[PDB]
C-alpha cells in the first residue's frame, strides 16, 4: 500500500494461485486464508500454525466450501471481501506498528473482515477467529526504531522536564531526525552566547522564512555531541511550548501561574538549556501594546541562567527587550541566521526529490529544479528565494502526474466505452431487455477486463509524466501563481501587449521588451519587474497598456492597481479638502495606497498623472526603483519584485501633445518625439526628481494617439461591442466603413485613445440601440452598421 | 405535497368502493379498513392478514357497525375521521421514509389515528390496534438507497474523521448528490495544487456568489475516481467546519483546544484531504485585525500536508496569508474560479426549473428562463448576474398561479356563492330559523359539493400555470421588484416621464429614450442605466425628472437619491464656502454617497450642481460610468446598472439663464437651446473633463421654461391641491384661468420650475385658507379659484 512491504503482497499472490488451483474465478477469502498459511512463516502464516491451522487442515475445509471448479479462473482478481481484507491490513498497519504493510496485518485484517469462506474455515477447524487475530498480533504487531525499554533515571531533572515540553534530543535519540540542511553559523554563535553565565541567553534574529527549526535541529545535535564548553556542563536540552499551556484553559492567570512554576523548576541551572520558541509573546511591553508580559518572571530567569535560553525572535522584538533592560539587555544578544543561497536553494529541493518518489514525479528534471527557483525569483516574487521552488516541483509533479491519467496516449477512450455500455446495459436490465442487457453487459465487461488490463498499460503514461518535473512543469505552476506558460508570454510579449493596445506601438514593443528582460532575468531580484513613466496626453495607449500587461503576463486582463497621484501629490494636495495642512503623505505611506498594491503582487501599478506631484512622491517610488521595496503600514516590508510600476504624466504636457502622426506626417512625429523627450522629460525631472527619472528604468514617450492606431483600437472596441452582445445572441457589426467613421472623434494632437471608448459608445451602442428599439434590426440577425454616404446607415444582413 | 406513491391512493379508492357498496354517504373508516385488506399485500394490507383481520373478518364487523344502506352514498368524500387518518399517514411517511406516501404508513397512520369504526373492527376481531401497527412496522423497512451496512476499513481514521464534520464523499457514496453543475475548471486546478508533497494546499479564489459547493461536489467526485496522482495514497476527504466548533462553546480557549486536538489527529497525513471552509477567518492575518489566529497551529499543519487543505475564501485573502508567511508560500496556493457565463446561467436555471414543477408552474418556459436572466441584468440588477433570474422564474412561477384561480371563467364565483349561503344559513341557525336556515343550508351544501367538484375542474388552473412561466411572466415579477410591466414602462416611458415633468419636454423625451435603451438590455452590463449631465438653469424639469423617472421605471414616485455636489467642493473650496471643509472625496467615497445607494441600488441618483467640485469627483463618477461599479466603504463593489445617475449643472449659467420662451421666441428659443448646448457644454468642460463627458452618456440641456410648460405643471399642482383636500372632504379647483395666473412665477431666465410650488401655495393654499376661515367658502363646497380680473376671484360652486 504505497510500496508498503512485501509480506502483504506475498500472502496475496498465493491467493491468486489458489484461485485457479481449486477453481475460483474471483479469489475468495478461502484462498486468502490459504495464501497466509502457504506463505509459511510470516506473521499470518505462523499464527495459523499456532492456532493449529496447517495449510492442509485449512485447504481440506476450503475445498469443501467452494473448492471446485472455476479453474478457468475468470479474470482472477479478488472477491470484494478479499479486497476489503487488504484495505483493512493497511489500517491494521497503522493498528499494529508498521508504516508499511505486512503479514500480521493481513491475518488481523482477515479476522476483522472475517467473512464467509475464510471465517468458516477457522471456526470449523476449531479455532476462534479472534484467537487468530490475537495470534498474529502476539508474534508481531510492531516495527521499532530507537525506543525500547531498559531503564535509566535522573532525579532533580524530573519536575522540570516533566511539565512541559517537547525535546528535540528525544526524537533524535529515538532518531527519526533529518538534519534538515542547516543553517550552521547560528549554532556556533548561539553556543558562545549560551555558554555564558550572565548573557547566557542566545537570541536568534533572522528570516523565519528558513524554518527556524532547521537551526534548532542543528543546535540539539551539537549541544549533545561532543565538543562543547565546560560552561555547558552536563546540559540537557528542553524546548518550551505555549500551545499545550493555552489548551484546556481560557483564563490568563493560570498560564502565568504555570509560567512562574516552570521558572522555579528550571533551578537545575548550569545543567539545563531551555529553548523558548515564540519568545516575543512572553516579552510584552513596548509599543502601544505588549504581547503578554511574562517577561517580568522571565527576565531574572534569563539572568540567573535557570532559564539559560535561546530566544527565537523577530524583526521588531529585539527593540522591545533591550528597551526593557537590564536582565533583558544584558541577557539578550543577537546573532545572524542563514538560509540556503539561491543556488543552494536548488540543491535542498533536489535532495527531497528522490523522497518525492512516493509522490512519484520527482527525482528529475534538474533544469526544472534550477527553474523552480529562478523563474519564481523574478516573477512571483511573493515569497523568499528558496521556498517557491520545491512547491513547483511537487505541483507540476502532480499537474502533469494528472496528465498521465488524463490522456494515456489518449487511450482513455476505452474506459469511456465501458461507461457508455454500463449505462445502457444496467438501465437496459432495469427495464429489461433481458438479452438486450446481455450484449450490453458483455460489451461492458469486455471493456472492464480490458480497462483494468490497460490501467496497468497506463504505466506508460507514468513513465511519461511520473518522474519528469520539467522546466515546463515548473513554469506552469509558476504561471498558476502568476518555460511552458511563461515563455510563450515572453517570446511573444510585444505581440501580446500589442493585441490589446495599438496606441503607440513604439511604446508597446519597448514595454514588452523591458518586462522580457526582467522576466528572463539579469536584473536585481529585489527590484520590480519594471519601473517606467508613460507620458503622452491621457491614455494614448498608456493606461490601456498597463491593462495589456496584466492581460499578457498573468492571463487576467486586470490584476493591475491604479492610483491617481494628483490627489496626494505631497505638493499642492495639502489643503484640497481641509483648510489646514493635514494629509497627503500620510495616506500614501500610512496604508491606503500601499495596502492596495499589497493585495495583488504581480500587479501593474499605475500611478496616474504624476506631472505635478512633489519630488517627495518620487522618493517613495524611488525605494522601489532602487531596492524594490516599499516601507509601509504595520512595519511590513513589501518586496516590490513583481509589481510593474507605470507612472503616467503630462508633465511638460504641450510637447507630448503633438502626435506621433502617421496619416498626417511621418517625420514631424519623430521631431515631436525628440522634443517631448526633452521639455517633457525635463519637466518630468523638475516636478519629480532627476534621481527619480534616473532610477526609473525607462521613460516611455507616447505622443498624441497615432492617426493610424485609432481605427485599430476602434476595431478592437467596436468588436468588443460586437462580442458582448453575441453572448446573449445578437450579431452586430460595424463595417470597416463604420469603424472608420467611429475613429474620427479623436485623431488627436492633445488627447489619447480615451475618446475612442466614447466614440464606440456613440457609434456602436447608441447607434444599434436606436435601431433595435425601432425594429430595423433584431435578435439573431446580423446588423450591419455601414457607411455608404459618409455617415452611418443601419443595414440588415443574415 | 404532490406526486405520492400509489399504495396510499390504492387503499383509499377501495374505501370509496365500500362507500357506496355497503351504503355509506361517507367513505368511512370502516371502508378504509376494508380498503387496506382488499388491497391485499400492501404493508398495511399484509399486516392485517397476519394478525387475523382478513377482508371477510373485517367486513363482518363493518356491517355490524354501519354497513347498510346509504347505497346512494350522497356526497361521497371521506369521513372527517378518514381525512385525519390520511393527513396523519402522509406525515407518518415523512416520519418513516416514503416521501411519496404508500400503504405501510397508512395502516401505521391508521393505528396512530386509531378511532371510529376502523379501530373497533380489529379490536373486536381479536387484534390490538398496536398488534396491527406493529405488524406493518416489522414488514416495513422504509425507503432508502445507498446504505445497507457491511463494514469498511479503518483504524487511525477513527479519532480524526469523527469530530467534525460533513463528508461530501458520504452523500456521494449514498449517491443522493446532484452534480451541482460545474464550476469545472477549478476542480482540476485543485488537484495539481493538492496531491503534491510540498504546498499541498489549494485555495479557491472567486465569486461567492457562484455557490462554492458546486465546485466542491465536483472535487468530491473526481478525488474518488480515479486520475488523481499517487502522492497521496488511500485518499480520504474530511470537511472542517467552524460552525460545529462554535456551537455549544462560549469561550475562545475551548475552541482552540479542540482545534489543537483535531490537528493532532490530522496525522493520517499525506493520505488525507482537509476542506477548510471560510479559510481566512482562521488565518487571522493582514489588515489591522485578523479574524481569529488559528493560523499558528494551522500553518505547519498545511505545510506538512497533514492538514493539506482546500480553501474556499475570497479574491484578496489568499495573499493576506502569504503576507503572514511562510506556510502560505509553501502551503496555500491559488487557482482561478469559474461561474456560469450569462447564457450558461440560464442553463443552470433550466436544469432545476423542471423540478420546481413541485410548485407546479415551471417546468419551463425556456424564453422565460432566458427572460429572468436577460431582463434582470439591466433592471434590478440588485444581485449578481445569475442569482436574480431563478428567483424571478420561481416568482412568476407562483404569481401567475394566483392569476389562474382569479381567472378561470371566474369560477371563483361558485365559492363566492357558497360563502354567502353559509353566512346567511349559519346566522339563521344561530337564531333558528330552522327551515329558514335549512334552505340556506341546502343552498350552501349544494354549493359545497359543486365547489369541490369545480375545484377538481381547477385542474385547468393547473393546466394554465404548470408550465407557463413566460417571458412576460418573469418580466412582471422582475418589474414587481423594479417584458410585461417593464415594456409598458418602456414603450410609454416618454409619455410617463412627460406626465410628471411637463417642464422642458425636449429633455424628457431624450431621457426617456436613453433609460429605455439601457432598460431594454442594449448597453453594457458593466455600466449604469443612465449617466447624464443635465445642464440648465435651476430645476427646469431637472430635479422633477429624477422624480418622474423613479415614478415611471421603479414603480414608486420616489426611488430617487439626491446629493448636492457643491458640498464636495474640492477645487471650489474658496469659491462658495461651506460650514464643514475637511473631507470631500473622503465624504463621498468613505461613506455618504455610497451607503445611500447601497440601501436601494435601484435609485435615481441626482447629483446636483456638479461644477462645484474638482475634476477628481468626476473620476469616481467616470468609474461608475465605465465599470458599472463603484469601489467604496467596507470593500464593496456596488454595481451601478440599477441606478440612473443624473448630474445637474448650471455650469454655463449665462446661457442657461437666457431662457427659452415660447412667448417671445421659438427660434431664438431653439437657439437659446442651441446656445446652451455649446457654450454651456464648454463651461461643462472647464468644470468637468472631456474624459468625464466621454464616459457620461448624453449631456441633456434644459433651458428655462417656456410659456407653456409651466401652466401644465401648475395644473398638476392645482390638482395635487384638489386631491389632498378631498380626502378630508374639501373641494377646491383652480380654473384653467387660475392655473395659468399661478404658472407665471416660474418664468425667469434664472428659474425653471421650483417657484411653481410657491405660486400654487400663495395663490391656492394660503388664499383658500384665508377664505375658509372668512366664511366665503365651506366644507364639501367646491371652491373655484378663477381669474375674472387678471387676479384671483373666488367663485363658489357645488
UniProtKB/Swiss-Prot annotation, chains A, B:
Stretch list, region I: 161-408
Matching Gene3D superfamilies: 1.10.8.60, Clp, N-terminal domain, P-loop containing nucleotide triphosphate hydrolases, UVR domain
Gene (name only): clpC
Family, similarity comment: Belongs to the ClpA/ClpB family. ClpC subfamily.
Function comment: Competence gene repressor; required for cell growth at high temperature. Negative regulator of comK expression. May interact with MecA to negatively regulate comK.
Record GO terms (molecular function): ATP binding; ATP hydrolysis activity
Region described as Repeat 2: 78-142
UniProt-recorded name of the protein: Negative regulator of genetic competence ClpC/MecB
Amino acid at each position: 500500500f504505497g510500496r508498503f512491504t512485501e509480506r502483504a503482497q506475498k500472502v496475496l499472490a498465493l491467493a491468486q494461485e489458489e484461485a485457479l488451483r481449486l477453481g475460483h474465478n474471483n479469489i475468495g477469502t478461502e484462498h486468502i486464508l490459504l495464501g497466509l498459511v502457504r506463505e509459511g512463516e510470516g506473521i499470518a502464516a505462523k499464527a495459523l500454525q499456532a492456532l493449529g491451522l496447517g495449510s492442509e487442515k485449512i485447504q481440506k475445509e476450503v475445498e469443501s466450501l467452494i473448492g471446485r471448479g472455476q479453474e478457468m479462473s475468470q479474470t482472477i482478481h479478488y472477491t470484494p471481501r478479499a479486497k476489503k481484507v487488504i484495505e483493512l491490513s493497511m489500517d491494521e498497519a497503522r493498528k499494529l506498528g508498521h508504516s508499511y504493510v505486512g503479514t500480521e496485518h493481513i491475518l488481523l485484517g482477515l479476522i476483522r473482515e472475517g467473512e464467509g469462506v475464510a471465517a468458516r474455515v477457522l471456526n470449523n477447524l476449531g479455532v476462534s477467529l479472534n484467537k487468530a487475530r490475537q495470534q498474529v498480533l502476539q508474534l508481531l504487531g510492531s516495527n521499532e526504531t530507537g525506543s525500547s525499554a531498559a531503564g535509566t533515571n535522573s532525579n532533580a531533572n524530573t519536575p522540570t522536564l516533566d511539565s512541559l515540553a517537547r525535546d528535540l534530543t528525544a526524537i533524535a535519540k529515538e532518531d527519526s531526525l533529518d538534519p534538515v540542511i542547516g543553517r550552521s553559523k547560528e549554532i556556533q554563535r548561539v553556543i558562545e552566547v549560551l555558554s555564558r553565565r550572565t548573557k547566557n541567553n542566545p537570541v536568534l534574529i533572522g528570516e523565519p522564512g528558513v524554518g527556524k527549526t532547521a537551526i534548532a535541529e542543528g543546535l540539539a545535535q551539537q549541544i549533545i555531541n561532543n565538543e562543547v564548553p565546560e560552561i555547558l556542563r552536563d546540559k540537557r536540552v528542553m524546548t518550551l511550548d505555549m500551545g499545550t499551556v493555552v489548551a484546556g484553559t481560557k483564563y490568563r492567570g493560570e498560564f502565568e501561574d504555570r509560567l512562574k512554576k516552570v521558572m522555579d523548576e528550571i533551578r537545575q541551572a548550569g545543567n539545563i538549556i531551555l529553548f523558548i520558541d515564540e519568545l516575543h509573546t512572553l516579552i510584552g511591553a513596548g509599543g502601544a501594546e505588549g504581547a503578554i508580559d511574562a517577561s517580568n518572571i522571565l527576565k531574572p530567569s534569563l539572568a540567573r541562567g535557570e532559564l539559560q535560553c535561546i530566544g527565537a525572535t523577530t524583526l521588531d522584538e529585539y527593540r522591545k527587550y533591550i528597551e526593557k533592560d537590564a536582565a533583558l539587555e544584558r541577557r539578550f544578544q543577537p546573532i545572524q541566521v542563514d538560509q540556503p543561497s539561491v543556488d543552494e536553494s536548488i540543491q535542498i529541493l533536489q535532495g527531497l526529490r528522490d523522497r518525492y518518489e512516493a509522490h512519484h514525479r520527482v527525482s528529475i528534471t534538474d533544469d526544472a529544479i534550477e527553474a523552480a527557483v529562478k523563474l519564481s525569483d523574478r516573477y512571483i516574487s511573493d515569497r523568499f528565494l528558496p521556498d517557491k521552488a520545491i512547491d513547483l516541483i511537487d505541483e507540476a509533479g502532480s499537474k502533469v502526474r494528472l496528465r498521465s491519467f488524463t490522456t494515456p496516449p489518449n487511450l482513455k477512450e476505452l474506459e469511456q466505452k465501458l461507461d457508455e455500455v454500463r449505462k445502457e446495459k444496467d438501465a437496459a436490465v432495469q427495464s429489461q431487455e433481458f438479452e438486450k442487457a446481455a450484449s450490453l453487459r458483455d460489451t461492458e465487461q469486455r471493456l472492464r477486463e480490458q480497462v483494468e488490463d490497460t490501467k496497468k498499460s497506463w504505466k506508460e503514461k507514468q513513465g511519461q509524466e511520473n518522474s519528469e518535473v520539467t522546466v515546463d512543469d515548473i513554469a506552469m505552476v509558476v504561471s498558476s501563481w502568476t518555460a511552458q506558460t511563461e515563455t510563450d508570454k515572453l517570446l511573444n510579449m510585444e505581440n501580446i501587449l500589442h493585441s490589446r493596445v495599438i496606441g503607440q506601438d513604439e511604446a508597446v514593443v519597448a514595454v514588452a521588451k523591458a518586462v522580457r528582460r526582467a522576466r528572463a532575468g539579469l536584473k536585481d531580484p529585489k527590484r520590480p519587474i519594471g519601473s517606467f513613466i508613460f507620458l503622452g496626453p491621457t491614455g494614448v495607449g498608456k493606461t490601456e497598456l498597463a491593462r495589456a500587461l496584466a492581460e499578457s503576463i498573468f492571463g487576467d486582463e486586470e490584476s493591475m492597481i491604479r492610483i491617481d497621484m494628483s490627489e496626494y501629490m505631497e505638493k499642492h494636495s495639502t489643503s484640497r479638502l481641509v483648510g489646514s495642512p493635514p494629509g497627503y503623505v500620510g495616506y500614501d505611506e500610512g496604508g491606503q495606497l500601499t495596502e492596495k498594491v499589497r493585495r495583488k503582487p504581480y500587479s501593474v501599478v499605475l500611478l496616474d498623472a504624476i506631472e505635478k506631484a512633489h519630488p517627495d512622491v518620487f522618493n517613495i517610488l524611488l525605494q522601489v526603483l532602487e531596492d524594490g521595496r516599499l516601507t509601509d503600514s504595520k512595519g511590513r516590508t513589501v518586496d516590490f519584485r513583481n509589481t510593474i510600476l507605470i507612472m503616467t504624466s503630462n508633465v511638460g504636457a504641450s510637447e507630448l501633445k503633438r502626435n506621433k502622426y502617421v496619416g498626417f506626417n511621418v517625420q514631424d512625429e519623430t521631431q515631436n518625439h525628440k522634443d517631448m523627450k526633452d521639455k517633457v522629460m525635463g519637466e518630468l525631472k523638475r516636478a519629480f526628481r532627476p534621481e527619480f527619472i534616473n532610477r526609473i528604468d525607462e521613460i516611455i514617450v507616447f505622443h498624441s494617439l497615432e492617426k493610424k492606431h485609432l481605427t485599430e483600437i476602434v476595431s478592437l472596441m467596436s468588436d468588443q461591442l460586437t462580442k458582448r452582445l453575441k453572448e446573449q445572441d445578437l450579431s452586430i457589426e460595424l463595417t470597416d466603413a463604420a469603424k472608420a467613421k467611429v475613429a474620427e472623434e479623436g485623431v488627436d494632437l492633445e488627447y489619447g485613445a480615451r475618446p475612442l471608448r466614447r466614440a464606440i459608445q456613440k457609434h456602436v451602442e447608441d447607434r444599434l440601440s436606436e435601431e433595435l428599439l425601432r425594429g430595423n434590426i433584431h435578435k439573431g440577425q446580423h446588423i450591419v452598421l455601414d457607411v455608404e454616404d459618409g455617415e452611418f446607415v443601419v443595414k440588415t444582413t443574415a
